[PDB]
Design a protein around this nucleic acid. Structure first.
Ligand SMILES: Nc1ncnc2c1ncn2[C@@H]1O[C@H](COP(=O)(O)OP(=O)(O)OP(=O)(O)O)[C@@H](O)[C@H]1O
Ligand SMILES: Nc1ncnc2c1ncn2[C@@H]1O[C@H](COP(=O)(O)OP(=O)(O)OP(=O)(O)O)[C@@H](O)[C@H]1O
Ligand SMILES: [Mg+2]
Ligand SMILES: [Mg+2]
Ligand SMILES: [Zn+2]
Ligand SMILES: [Zn+2]
Lengths: 345, 353
DNA sequence: ATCTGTACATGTACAGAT
DNA sequence: ATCTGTACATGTACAGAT
DNA sequence: ATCTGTACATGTACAGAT
DNA sequence: ATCTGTACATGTACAGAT
């Protein structure tokens, strides 16, 4: 049943090769233009993030996330109205308070200029979507591929106080891992008609999340060549697919994204830390317990950011009750009728 | 029972404070003197190693190991007659230690030791001297008299950042225990070469160096579980270190009574337990409730090593620490009888002093 | 004036003490 | 159970040097 | 500072074995 | 049906060279 779906969802080696070869060309050239030109983003470094680099991308290698991160010395953060995730912040002179919109606009300008000069790849820059920190590339290998270039500020200080109680991995990955993770930099991305709209940045833990995905067992050998396989990634994939399929069919679900599922499974991996609670033989009960957890998040209207406990991704302000009830009904239907949506194209 | 022995063996915070305060002074001052002037050892860095920094030092904080490690770029190793552990080194502030491209361990050690003695003479704050050089030892050993006796072994080491020598390829067999990512990451760290410093009267006597994995061993001791939470505040305690301590004590007590055991050292027990931790990787095979069977299975393993004359270096599989060349059969049989005796009569030697 | 090797500043795991 | 000293990893301030 | 070379983890693909 | 072993592909950390 679910093994068959996972077979469908598995990327093909051939497609992986073709997609990656084209993407790396475009990205390499963009990264070079950010330094070889005396741009205000000289020193920016590349960090690959999201599902493709975590090995949980499903169906096709058609969406790539990449961070162009810029180290900024001793910045001062001021939290935005107790939200936990959003901050004002203090070469960059002409982006003054460091304005996210002004900095993003210049960043975006550079990329567009450079993209116009690319003559061997069919590639363009997608119209800016308000509410997105990314510059999005649309590549036409014969097949459609999207690349989100995310601008990020990199700070090396202590993580902000709103995260103090986040990353609750102590009983799963442990205290040494947590302490070491919190010694890495933290990232601010320009996520953005009220208030301090254009000067607000959002914390990003994409780097931490990538380490977690690739080091996800309570045992060091989980999913390694001299360890046992678990089904943690496979459940993420199934849940991701369920949401994608539903979203494709129902405009009512526009406010939901894969990060909601990722966040939910992070909490499930914390609640059920033992690798034996994710035995491949138990794929079905595991998938099912994840569904039940997600439904409880929907019912209670509560899905805390894993890194920022006070930030509720399912607050009324972000996603209307109607949407959450709608998604509850549709998930409950699929669950009670053997997931017919998994059988469609 | 063994819990009571472990109570005796536990270091006291007071003693730890007094010992460490004095040790860190002496070491800090020695390290600073190595950076002065055109000393050949400018750039040498401190790495704390061995039982005290692994939290398996027993009885008293009276012996501390420290490495003064020097990065040497552009190094060619030539293995010494297929031994796995021993190397010539080839290629500069080290100019004065070279003989036609070959780095002399004994000349370098001698200068290192000269500088330390000179500096120690200038310390009027604590009662400290340099122990007569012991043949077969790379260390400059400091004898400190806080009112209590404390030894500090300062080991000179060459640090190479290249890939570990081929003799180690099959060593560190941690894949089923700590895993492949840990193994890979550990093998990306530098390797260390220390002076072999025998006066056996063999070819290349003064130019032979020995591999050291003290840094790797320290990481292993402090990250010893198959679960990442082993011995942590939101995990379960294991008894891996406690078994190491008990076995260490058994050997120390025996060694202090019996001159026949001079050839044995604590590294033999450390190596044996590393193999036992590989053989029995699950944290559940080191439950604290099972301290006795765990200690017992370790003893039985060590006894088999003694009987079969085989204890492979954990990093260098072909190097046999129990070879005939190192330890005569009589010594191994002697230690076998004494271990079997203690084991069969309730460990009376644990009740001594 | 600017730069930097050295030492202080901060945070926490480990394990001993209460 | 909670508290506390040491070790150790990383970030950063600055006297003395350039 | 930038670039390449090496090593090996995480994947996929498929035959032959269980 | 599943598992195991080998081949074949990409990503990624870091040393040593330029
Ligand atoms: N709303 C959000 N808040 C915080 N971080 C987010 C948010 N949306 C996405 N991200 C971060 O950006 C990364 C990439 O986003 P993206 O939408 O491409 O999802 P993904 O995890 O790559 O999965 P997929 O692309 O397969 O749907 C996420 O993994 C996450 O770290
Ligand atoms: N024969 C040896 N071969 C290889 N390395 C050795 C040998 N003897 C000692 N070492 C290394 O030197 C370190 C310090 O040596 P030392 O004799 O002080 O042992 P230790 O582990 O500190 O135990 P303790 O001091 O409590 O007996 C060891 O931990 C080990 O890494
Ligand atoms: Mg993505
Ligand atoms: Mg020692
Ligand atoms: Zn796993
Ligand atoms: Zn443990």
């Amino acid at each position: 049943k679910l093994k068959k779906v996972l077979d469908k969802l598995r990327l093909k080696r051939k497609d992986i090769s073709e997609a990656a070869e084209t993407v790396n060309k475009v990205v390499e050239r963009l990264l070079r233009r950010m330094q070889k030109r005396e741009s205000e983003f000289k020193g920016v470094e590349q960090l690959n993030t999201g599902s493709y680099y975590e090995h949980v991308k499903i169906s096709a290698p058609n969406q790539f996330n990449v961070m162009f991160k810029l180290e900024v010395p001793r910045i001062e953060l001021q939290e935005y109205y107790e939200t936990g995730a959003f901050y004002l912040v203090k070469p960059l002179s002409h982006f003054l308070v460091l304005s996210a919109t002004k900095m993003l606009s210049k960043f975006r300008k550079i990329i567009k200029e450079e993209v116009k000069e690319i003559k061997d790849i069919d590639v363009s820059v997608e119209k800016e979507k308000p509410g997105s920190p990314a510059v999005t590339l649309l590549i036409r290998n014969p097949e459609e591929i999207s690349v989100d270039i995310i601008l990020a500020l990199e700070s090396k200080g202590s993580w902000p106080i709103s995260t103090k109680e986040g990353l609750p991995i102590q009983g799963w990955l442990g205290t040494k891992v947590r302490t070491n993770l919190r010694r890495e930099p933290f990232y601010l991305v320009p996520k953005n008609g009220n208030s301090f709209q254009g000067e607000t940045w959002r914390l990003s833990f994409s780097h931490t999340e990538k380490y977690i995905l690739n080091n996800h067992g309570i045992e060091k050998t989980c999913c390694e060549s001299s360890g046992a396989k678990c089904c943690r990634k496979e459940c993420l994939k199934l849940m991701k697919y369920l949401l994608e399929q539903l979203k494709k069919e129902f405009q009512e679900l526009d406010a939901f994204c894969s990060y909601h599922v990722k966040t939910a499974i992070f909490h499930m991996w914390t609640q059920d830390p033992q690798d034996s609670q994710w035995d491949p033989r138990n794929l079905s009960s595991c998938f099912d317990k994840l569904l039940a957890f997600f439904l409880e998040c929907l019912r209670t209207e509560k899905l805390d950011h894993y890194f920022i406990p006070k930030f509720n991704l399912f607050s009324q302000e972000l996603i209307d009750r109607k949407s959450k009830e709608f998604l509850s009904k549709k998930i409950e239907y699929e669950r009670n009728n053997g997931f017919p949506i998994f059988d469609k194209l």
